[PDB]
Design a protein around this ligand. Structure first.
Ligand SMILES: [Mg+2]
Ligand SMILES: [Mg+2]
Ligand SMILES: [Mg+2]
Ligand SMILES: [Mg+2]
Ligand SMILES: [Mg+2]
Ligand SMILES: [Mg+2]
Ligand SMILES: [Mg+2]
Ligand SMILES: [Mg+2]
Ligand SMILES: [Mg+2]
Lengths: 88, 63, 117, 52, 104
RNA sequence: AGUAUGGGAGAGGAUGGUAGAAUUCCAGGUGUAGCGGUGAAAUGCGUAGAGAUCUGGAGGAAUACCGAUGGCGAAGGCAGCCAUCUGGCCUAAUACUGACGCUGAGGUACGAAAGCAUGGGGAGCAAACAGGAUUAGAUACCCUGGUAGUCCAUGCCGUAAACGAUGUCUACUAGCCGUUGGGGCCUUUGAGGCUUUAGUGGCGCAGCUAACGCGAUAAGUAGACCGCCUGGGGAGUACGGUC
């Protein structure tokens, strides 16, 4: 699992302003880190169905936030997806 | 249980005291339960009925 | 032949039959009796009186070993557990202690099906 | 309630060794669960008898 | 690291060795890094029921802080040591250093 | 509506280990005539020694008491103890984003028990089946045995009175008494009394209802979206199609 220091680093790297923890960029980056971390757990536990529901929820939340960012401003959306390495 | 006897206790009184010890222990109840296999649905229904009866009895006492 | 001062009486009571056995400590047996063994063959085996006669005969047989004080162990439901100890006391023995040793599983094997009678 | 406190743990165990319910002892729900867990741990550590 | 409480039961015949075994465990823990918050020797106590036809054993208590690799090493040693008869390991939050009951 | 930081409760999920009780079987010590079962019997077991009792072993499955109108989970469903990985929920005050929301045809994932495929395991229970009984007959209900199966690994199957017989989300509308996890306030005799909040129960005004009944966990008063119904049979059946 990720640590408080890791989350603080991600927020520092993706924060628009001071104390900015609610920005779509910060939220999407945090979700991406969490998902890529959980991939390892789900490699070793294929039949842990109950956690995969939460993983799918994280995926859906990221999708909705990315769509909102795209609707509001395209340049920030492109920068975020490029920085985080996401196809769409 | 282990109902040890006094020096002069009558055997009949000893058996009476052993009956009280065993009745408090409730060993025979588990043996009665174990005779046959009860289905989970039936156990659920029985426990629900028991809880309802207990609540009604407590309300009657309060009234 | 052998003389032992201390003994133990096991009463294996059931809903169908009562078995009364007399053993020494360390479990070696001395005498035994049963309701079916002493007449009463049929449903009357479970009746407490047959337990009393079985206990009387078992005690009379065991008296040859010269034991006057005996411990009591009882296992199982059904009538006959009380009559056996009463008869053992009446016969002339001294009952030092009485305990229940009926085995209780901690949710192990599945019991047989219920009878639809 | 900790598994190493046998003097108190024994106040909620019968002679047969069975755990006394909450109804008879007047304890709280949260306390009862901790006490049962402690009794189980003490039984495992052979500090209190499982039965008899 | 994490905090673990350990209780060990030792065969009475190997009682004289207890001082060595605890010293070896502490040495390994400290070599890894280690923080041994509590060490207690309850002494030889009677068992409430026999274990492997043994009616009494030596009781040891430890409160330590160590990592997963160490925890694995101690678990393996406890499993493959014949002097030990039963061991309890409990995860704890924060460290207990106060004198405990049963220490008489 | 969502995010960060401090705390709390929980049989929520996955993997591995370990403890006690009991049943079966196998050897050994004492010991002799029955054991077992039913309304009553009989089959069956027993003098090459049963049953009962004590001692030592093999193996499988499930976790007494705590236990609760209790708890957790989207649902199905989850019960001894310990370690590792892991999802959600409750709760305090701050600091952020700024409508990012609700629902959802097609589609997709999960989904009790039974059953299916390959390979293991098999104590107890037990469809099929064998014998003994009851009966006019007994293909059953009762009794003695007993295979698949129930268990493990990997997949498939997509069904239930899968029920609260009550789709999801939102705001509002007398009160009274319980219980679970928290927050705040006041008493003193160390535990109690008031509030608040999220669950879970019992009554009941207004309102609704064919009646029974529901009644802040609505079946009341209103809004958004979806699914479904149109007399009983024929019939969740035929043909075609997909799996
Ligand atoms: Mg598995
Ligand atoms: Mg039967
Ligand atoms: Mg939807
Ligand atoms: Mg659809
Ligand atoms: Mg049968
Ligand atoms: Mg499937
Ligand atoms: Mg259907
Ligand atoms: Mg329906
Ligand atoms: Mg069809």
């Amino acid at each position: 699992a990720l640590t408080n220091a890791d989350r603080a680093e991600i927020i520092a790297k993706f924060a628009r302003a001071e104390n900015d923890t609610g920005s779509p960029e910060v939220q999407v980056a945090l979700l991406t880190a969490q998902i890529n971390d959980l991939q390892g757990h789900f490699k070793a536990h294929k039949h842990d169905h109950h956690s995969r529901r939460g993983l799918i929820r994280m995926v859906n939340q990221r999708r909705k936030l990315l769509d909102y960012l795209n609707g509001k401003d395209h340049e920030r959306y492109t920068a975020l997806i490029g920085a985080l390495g996401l196809r769409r | 249980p282990q109902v040890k006897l006094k020096e002069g206790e009558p055997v009949d009184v000893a058996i009476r005291r052993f009956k009280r010890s065993c009745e408090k222990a409730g060993v025979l109840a588990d043996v009665r339960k174990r005779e046959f296999y009860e289905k989970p649905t039936q156990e659920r229904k029985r426990k629900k009925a028991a809880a309802v009866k207990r609540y009604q009895k407590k309300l009657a006492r309060e009234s | 032949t052998r003389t032992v001062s201390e003994g133990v009486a096991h009463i294996h009571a059931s809903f169908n039959n009562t078995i009364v056995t007399i053993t020494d400590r360390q479990g070696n047996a001395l005498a035994w009796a049963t309701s079916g063994g002493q007449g009463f063959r049929g449903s009357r085996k479970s009746t407490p009186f047959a337990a009393q006669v079985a206990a009387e005969v078992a005690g009379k047989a065991a008296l040859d070993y010269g034991l006057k004080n005996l411990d009591v162990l009882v296992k199982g439901p059904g009538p006959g557990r009380e009559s056996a100890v009463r008869a053992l006391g009446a016969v002339g023995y001294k009952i030092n202690s009485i305990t229940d040793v009926t085995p209780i599983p901690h949710n192990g094997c599945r019991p047989p099906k219920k009878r639809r009678v | 309630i900790d598994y190493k406190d046998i003097d108190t743990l024994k106040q909620y165990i019968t002679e047969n060794g069975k755990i006394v319910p909450s109804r008879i002892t007047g304890t709280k729900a949260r306390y009862q669960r901790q006490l049962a867990l402690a009794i189980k741990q003490a039984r495992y550590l052979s500090l209190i008898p499982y039965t008899d | 690291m994490r905090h673990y409480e350990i209780v060990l039961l030792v065969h009475p015949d190997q009682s004289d060795q207890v001082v060595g075994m605890v010293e070896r465990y502490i040495s390994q823990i400290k070599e890894a890094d280690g923080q041994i918050h509590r060490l207690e020797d309850w002494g030889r106590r009677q068992l409430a029921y026999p274990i492997n036809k043994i009616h009494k054993a030596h009781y040891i208590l430890m409160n330590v802080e160590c990592g997963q690799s160490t925890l694995d090493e101690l678990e393996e040693l406890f499993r493959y040591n014949d002097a030990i008869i039963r061991n309890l390991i409990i995860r704890r939050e924060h460290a207990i250093t106060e004198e405990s009951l049963l220490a008489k």
